[PDB]
């Protein structure tokens, strides 16, 4: 089972955590809970922004221009990236833009965080036909002492 996880600003703008103008410890914890003990797949740029692997997981970096890092697994195609994850229940795809696009037709589950924040951005989360997806979980939270904006956790399962 292939699942995507993403934080969406208004108009489905996506970016790197350290470049997005918000502070959302509840989202970090949401992210941690849903990716724990699962293999993760990410692109070149996401790998470079994240600085180190997510611990206790297998980290697969999908890139044409492979790197040398000894802690992750370097693949060059979508098929190769799925195989390198092995026979697990759920694979977590974490970005960035192109890699979301590539893994969507193969995806059966989405974890979205809808953040109420207007951010400038060139990259947007792939358009996904809402007829093909069903909401099974939604939870809205106001901004509070620690969280800079209101936000909505959503889980979508295909069909």
């Amino acid at each position, epitope marked *: 089972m292939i699942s995507l996880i993403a934080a969406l600003a208004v108009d489905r703008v996506i970016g*790197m*955590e*350290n*470049a*997005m*103008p*918000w*502070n959302l410890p509840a989202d*970090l914890a949401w*992210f941690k809970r849903n990716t724990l003990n699962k293999p993760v797949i990410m692109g070149r740029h996401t790998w470079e*922004s*994240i*600085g*180190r*692997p*997510l*611990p206790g997981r297998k980290n697969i970096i999908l890139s044409s221009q492979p790197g040398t890092d000894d802690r992750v697994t370097w693949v060059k195609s979508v098929d190769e990236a799925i195989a390198a994850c092995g026979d697990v229940p759920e694979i977590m795809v*974490i970005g960035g833009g192109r890699v979301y696009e590539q893994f969507l037709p193969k995806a059966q589950k989405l974890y979205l965080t809808h953040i109420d924040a207007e*951010v400038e951005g060139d990259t947007h989360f792939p358009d996904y036909e809402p007829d093909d997806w069903e909401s099974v979980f939604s939870e809205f939270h106001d901004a509070d*002492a*620690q*969280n*800079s904006h209101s936000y909505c956790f959503e889980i979508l399962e295909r069909r």
Partner: nanobody
Amino acid sequence: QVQLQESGGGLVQAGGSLRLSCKASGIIFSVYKMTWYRQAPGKERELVALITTNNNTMTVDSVKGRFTISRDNVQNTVYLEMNNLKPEDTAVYYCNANRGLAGPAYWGQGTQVTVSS
């Protein structure tokens, strides 16, 4: 070690100005989102302001127009310029740095701000 060190705190009267700084050591400062928090005794720490790696800022409503956050990557320092201070701003202010989803995140030891009136 201690990666982050705040300074600039102290006592001022209402309506006065103050400039806080947080100097980072031993880290690649430019790759961190920086945030200022504050905590009054017993009360929980609350977000004050953040600045991204590409200089996007956000300040919370209670300090809008009074506080300003900036960073100087060359000096490994983030700043909180505070103007028109009010007694309700009295707190220990804490600098925080975060790399991204996998961390690491660092906290300073904090600096006391007391406003009189």
